[PDB]
Amino acid sequence: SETAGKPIECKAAIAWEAKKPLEVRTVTVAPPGPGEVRVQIKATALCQTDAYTLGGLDPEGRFPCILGHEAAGVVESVGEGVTSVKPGDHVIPCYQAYCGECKFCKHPESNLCVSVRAFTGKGVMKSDGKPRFTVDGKPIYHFMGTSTFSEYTVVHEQSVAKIDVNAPLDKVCLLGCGVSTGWGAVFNTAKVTAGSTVAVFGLGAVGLAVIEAAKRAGASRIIAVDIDPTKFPTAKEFGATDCINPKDHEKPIQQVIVEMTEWGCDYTFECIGNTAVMRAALECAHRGWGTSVIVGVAAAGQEISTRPFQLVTGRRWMGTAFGGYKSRVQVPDLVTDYMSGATLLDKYITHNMKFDQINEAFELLHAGECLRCVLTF
Template sequence: MKIRGAVLTAAGAEQPYATSQPLGIHELHIDDPRPSEVLVRVEAAGVCHSDLSVVNGDRVRPLPMLLGHEAAGVVEAVGSEVSDLKPGDHVVMAYVPSCGECPFCLADQPALCTPGAAANGAGELLAGGRRLSDAAGQPVNHHLGVSGFSDYAVIDRSSLVRVDDDIPFDVAALFGCAMSTGFGAVTRTAGVQAGDTVVVIGLGGVGLSAVMAAAAVGASVIVAVDPVEQKRERAREMGATHIATPDDAAQMVADVTGGARWVFEAVGSAAVLAQAVALTGRGGTTVAIGLPHPSATLTIPALPIVAESKTITGSYMGSTRPQIDIPAMIDLWRDGNLPVERLISGYRPLHEINEALDELASGAAIRQIITPQR
């Protein structure tokens, strides 16, 4: 069948993207789903820094590629081996497919699935190969097994989580990346407990999700750090007990925590990660969530790691188990404990995807929602 999608053919375009148009809206052919796959009508897709990092070249991916990895939609058709989804079901898309058989999947760590990571890196689906091709019949790569900046997508069953029909698509989409990554980092990777002290640096969709998670589990102090005042105020609305600029953060954290138990870096900057380590207190842990440029290196004082028993750990996709953790997060949202809708800063049709990238790159946007069906 024919679909429309936002395709990147070359990385590193100059800003503004509204002028350079790195993403073109193309008519593509999409194959029928293979036995373990599902055809989904995409209703909402969030614009995330992981999309921007492919456009600007920070994350090298095989091109051409149909971008978008945070999305929700409706099942249109299922492969012959898919028995637990049916047409009409509403689904959230998770950006790491899981094979269920590798050592990480067997250890309840599907976010680290080895075949899933290999497929994502190659621009393929988990079953191998691509289901997308352009007008000339040339293959087009998938983005993280989702390619949600399109009106339809073929996706591996393991990347889909069925959700109730009454959940708005814009809210549902955010559970696939922003909430999974930020909430999971706090609750799964770190295991923050009631009464803990928390610092979150970087208040985009993922960082604000971490703030919400820390508030939901009862952290006693939550310091939210960002240079943008609007984002700091949004963090206060979502449960931050204190807010600070990057320049003021050291003094603020010293005053209110004496050294935080948990510090979450959600910027994707080696320099900011070094600051996060410095803000981490004795016996505390720095959790790296943001994706830095592949060439970035981290330089920190070595002695405090030993003398103050500090830990540095990474968190990919929040260490989440999508089939378990996304429904649990939705329950918290229903109870009013996760105000996910406050992450949304605007809506755009598919043909305005480049303008959405400009808004994201400027720091003005938190999560814009692309609506491919409009």
Template sequence: MKTRGAVLTQVPGRYEVVELDVDDPRHGEIRVRMAASGICHSDDHQATGDVPAGRIPLAGGHEGAGVVEAVGPGTGGFAEGDHVVFSFVPACGRCRWCATGHQNLCDLGASLGTNARWEDPTSFRLSLDGEPVGQMCGVSTFCEYTTVSTASAVRIDPSIPLDVACLTGCGVGTGWGAAVNGAGVRPGQVVIVMGVGGIGINAVQGAARAGAGAVIAVDPVAFKRTTALEFGATHGVPDIREATDLARTLTNGQGADATIVSVGVVTGEHVGQAVRSVRKAGTCVVVGLGEARTREGDISLTELVLFEKTIKGSLFGSSAPTADIPAQLRAWQAGELRLEELITTRYRLDDVARGFEDLRAGKNIRGLIEFDR
């Protein structure tokens, strides 16, 4: 069938809406009519080339929710009409990582960069004028219809609005989990969050929910700092040096217990600043991505060793999406998690390029594409 979707045809480039062919689902697959998709910096990394795409043309989008429209032959666990949220990292449920509760590290994720089917890097479900089109994270949520593996889909309560639900497919779980799982925030601790966009804002509310005594939000954009205060930050400052000084005044000169790096384009300098901001035995959690070929960081190895500081990467908040996405939505239903307040601007699919312009300009916490607008 035909579908419209936002595609990169060159890198560096911008997303353009074109008409695509989308295949019927095969065994282990479903076709989904999209309701909403978040506009995330990871999609922009593909457009700029910071993170090389495995396939061009590439249909973008990895944070989304919709309704199952067709189920592949012999595929269990899903039915037409089911409401689903996509997990941008697939979960097979069988590998060592899934079996030990680390679905975010599922072995299927090794194929993410191919933009093809997990099991076959030459197999695609979208095409443009007969040419295969890659799918961002295997899902391509910037398409009106998309065919995906069931390993990438999580069924949810149909009473939950899909625009709200879609945010748990990346931004919420990644930020919240960075604080709760990655940093292991405990009551009374001092936490710094560097960058409070769509990821960092959820690290703020995760740290606050975990009982942090102080959450210092760092962002050069005043609107984002103000928003962070509404999501549980106790302080908002424009740069990490000020945040570090503030953390030390709150901890008898020691520094933050944890600093979470969720800057849009992370550099080695950012990581070095974060490491210096934490106390002895403190933790630096790196969430954001940067230029993929970066190999150096501004880190004092002496400080790292003698002060026993920890640097951790955090993919999708170190979460298990099949369990954590429904849990986050239950928390929203109980009033313990803010979701709809994350949405700054709603766009039509045809306005996707403007959405990324607004993202780069710092105008949004989260921009959202709604397919029925």
């Protein structure tokens, strides 16, 4: 290789501080240490989670840092000990790691690996406790263990899903977070049964993925809820049978849903990050057995509340992280399902832009005018 074992200077987008636009400039990327993989990002999308940390809403937010966590790329080089990937492998770096040996990797119902979170949560690497990015010798920190807003990033081996080398990297970049989360919320967390009724709160890429998955699960009714009705036509494309704007009703939205379904929907999904809506989604879960799945990420500190009578009379409050998918094991399975022609993944990409316009993409998502914006270098 031409770059293996040596630093790489490449284009990236740095967040020097919160609530400021990113600076697209050159950074230096160190070679991978033991158990690490240096990846050449080929495509990367913006998620609402990136704007969440950029807006100062992350308690563990550490600046300066390279954001980004929805990407697909090619292995440029690996550090010593790395056996699972090799240069040339097509990969998807995942915020959720997989070690196969911790208690959560071994449990059938969890994907919350603890192999590297103590370091990825701090924006550093496990091998030496430091980051791999510098600018004029000063350290720039990692984000969600991925930091995909850079031509080359360095990640832990446990965070690297090896995927079908023939899958288009600018489409499956979405499988690193949002769309996978919405799908697994249906298939893994809720396990929607055929015939069921569903309510989805928030119609971004995540909520639309809940709708697509619930459709595929055989749901007989899917109520799409959003305060922005310009997202309704796409929601009906994915399979929504009803679209509801909360601002068209003086009743609370959970009362509206209950009246449409007498007792509530068998499953409800919150895909916003609004604690008042999370409460609403649980209270319009069906009496006796309804399930509500929190998908959105609320601002740190905020609390959800309900009357305990809601759970005593049969409703179930749960949440999901990355759809319950064990990353390195199951992300390749999602790529395989994409390559089989069975998904609507291509429909989630509303804009393809160059990496230099990353800030316009952030304005697109703050304005609700995009689903997923895929950046290429």
